[PDB]
Amino acid sequence: MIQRTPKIQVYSRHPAENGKSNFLNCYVSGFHPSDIEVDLLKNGERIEKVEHSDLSFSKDWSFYLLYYTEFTPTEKDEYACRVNHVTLSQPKIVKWDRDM
Amino acid sequence: GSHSMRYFFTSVSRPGRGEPRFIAVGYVDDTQFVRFDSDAASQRMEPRAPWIEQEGPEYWDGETRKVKAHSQTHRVDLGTLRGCYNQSEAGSHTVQRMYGCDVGSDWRFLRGYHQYAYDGKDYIALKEDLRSWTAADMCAQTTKHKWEAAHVAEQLRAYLEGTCVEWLRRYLENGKETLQRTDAPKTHMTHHAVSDHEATLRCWALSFYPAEITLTWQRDGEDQTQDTELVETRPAGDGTFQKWVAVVVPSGQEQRYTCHVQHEGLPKPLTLRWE
Ligand code: NA
Secondary structure (H helix, E strand, O other): OOOEOOEEEEEEOOOOOOOOOEEEEEEEEEEEOOOOEEEEEEOOEEOOOOEEOOOEEOOOOOEEEEEEEEEOOOOOOOEEEEEEOOOOOOOEEEEOOOOO | OOEEEEEEEEEEOOOOOOOOEEEEEEEEOOEEEEEEEOOOOOOOOEEOOHHHOOOOHHHHHHHHHHHHHHHHHHHHHHHHHHHHOOOOOOOOOEEEEEEEEEEOOOOOEEEEEEEEEEOOEEEEEEOOOOOOEEEOOHHHHHHHHHHHHOOHHHHHHHHHHHHHHHHHHHHHHHOHHHHOOOEOOEEEEEEEEOOOOEEEEEEEEEEEEOOOOEEEEEEOOEEOHHHOEEOOOEEOOOOOEEEEEEEEEEOOOHHHEEEEEEOOOOOOOEEEOOO
């Protein structure tokens, strides 16, 4: 069966300022089949309130989803996105890097 | 300018774990406005844009009836397709369908689309003429025989040339603050030393709408596409888009590198320099 690997981006909606409420995005695109596990992490722990977009797909039939939540960037808190999919031998963790 | 409406259906078998999943979404341009999820409690087509909320109960009743009827035909298609490909009853499979219309600047019909994939590969598609079918594999050719005999394309063409365009026109006016808008990108470049000897140059486009954008790097005026990491254009969450392009360059050559941005909200293509 066709399988395509998720492309994972973790990023803020707005340029991060410590102490200022913002929105953390994990955007996963380019994947097939549609079953996927996406979690937003703070200091390694799953954020329970996370929302996601409705399943959609691109012209090449690959799927895309947006997972998102409010967050407050700080100096010391570490945010990340964890994705698992049939194409991945183990979950992939992409760390949020605000200096990009 | 030009506009489009698209519906996207995803149907997934899960043998032993209940009836197939069916998810439907509707878009005008890059703005989503409806959904239906067969697993959700409501069992209703639901609004996903503020400007569709005003539609009356006949609309939501009609759309719910229609999308449910589509879920039922897709349920039976998963059987047909499994049988035709001689696949095991245990495995999960995916059908996808996309359809809709494009209008030009005059809001008149320009093109239609009605196309299907099975397990992530083209299966059958209506051609641009809205009369004839592309079917690669043998299974899809069988489908085409049945759809040609049943004059399936004439019904689809009627929706795409008429109803689709009528509703699109209504939505463009009701949602005009969202959909008749261009947000030009806010651009910059960043530099980050990867080491003593090389640096990551990243060219950013932020807060833009619609999603269509081009970002390229040049080195002394030569396109560097082969050496560029271009991320997929991504949603900010607030109805705008973000994109970046990166090159890794030798420390000291930064001024040889220029970023190039084209977006409909720009009066002219923009060049960013290390200047
Ligand atoms: Na996996």
